Design a protein around this ligand. Structure first.
Ligand SMILES: OC[C@H]1O[C@@H](O[C@H]2[C@H](O)[C@@H](O)[C@H](O[C@H]3[C@H](O)[C@@H](O)[C@H](O[C@H]4[C@H](O)[C@@H](O)[C@H](O[C@H]5[C@H](O)[C@@H](O)[C@H](O)O[C@@H]5CO)O[C@@H]4CO)O[C@@H]3CO)O[C@@H]2CO)[C@H](O)[C@@H](O)[C@@H]1O
Ligand SMILES: [Gd]
Ligand SMILES: [Gd]
Ligand SMILES: [Gd]
Ligand SMILES: [Gd]
Ligand SMILES: [Gd]
Ligand SMILES: [Gd]
Ligand SMILES: [Gd]
Ligand SMILES: [Gd]
Ligand SMILES: [Gd]
Ligand SMILES: [Gd]
Ligand SMILES: [Gd]
Ligand SMILES: [Gd]
Length: 92
């Protein structure tokens, strides 16, 4: 389903890893700078930001920089991932 401020199921804290699964809809407040999505589980994942960048990918071995994500509350849908994985959202 859709992902947004009405049905997010997890909230990410800046720099704090959490277990993520395909289908999750994650709230993340970016106060400034550029969004970063990082994972080291080796599980490939992809994301859509509501009203924002689409088709973001991460190999599971480092950080994906997402230019042009708004400051403020973001809603990030995990579109694809083969299994649960540990991920963190950050900004700098
Ligand atoms: O502050 C003003 C100034 O900020 C600059 O922005 C900086 C920012 O402040 C830094 O935090 C950021 O640094 C990040 C590093 O680039 C990145 O390499 C590092 O990534 C770590 C990750 O945090 C860590 O979790 C991960 O650990 C994994 C191990 O590698 C694996 O062995 C193990 O299995 O799994 C663990 C995780 O469970 O390691 C990676 C490295 O491999 O994260 C840093 C943030 O925490 O850099 C920014 C600059 O590049 C900004 O640039 C300036 O403009 C601004 O003025
Ligand atoms: Gd709520
Ligand atoms: Gd850890
Ligand atoms: Gd775990
Ligand atoms: Gd920058
Ligand atoms: Gd937008
Ligand atoms: Gd990098
Ligand atoms: Gd908002
Ligand atoms: Gd808010
Ligand atoms: Gd808030
Ligand atoms: Gd699967
Ligand atoms: Gd770990
Ligand atoms: Gd910072």
């Amino acid at each position: 389903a859709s992902c947004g401020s009405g049905n997010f199921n997890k909230t990410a804290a800046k720099g704090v890893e959490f277990s993520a699964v395909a289908g999750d809809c994650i709230k993340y407040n970016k106060s400034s700078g550029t969004l970063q999505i990082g994972s080291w589980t080796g599980v490939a994942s992809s994301y859509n930001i509501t009203s924002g960048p689409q088709g973001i990918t991460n190999t599971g071995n480092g950080w994906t920089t997402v230019a042009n994500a708004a400051n403020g509350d973001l809603y990030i849908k995990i579109v694809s991932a083969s299994r649960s994985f540990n991920v963190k959202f950050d900004n700098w």
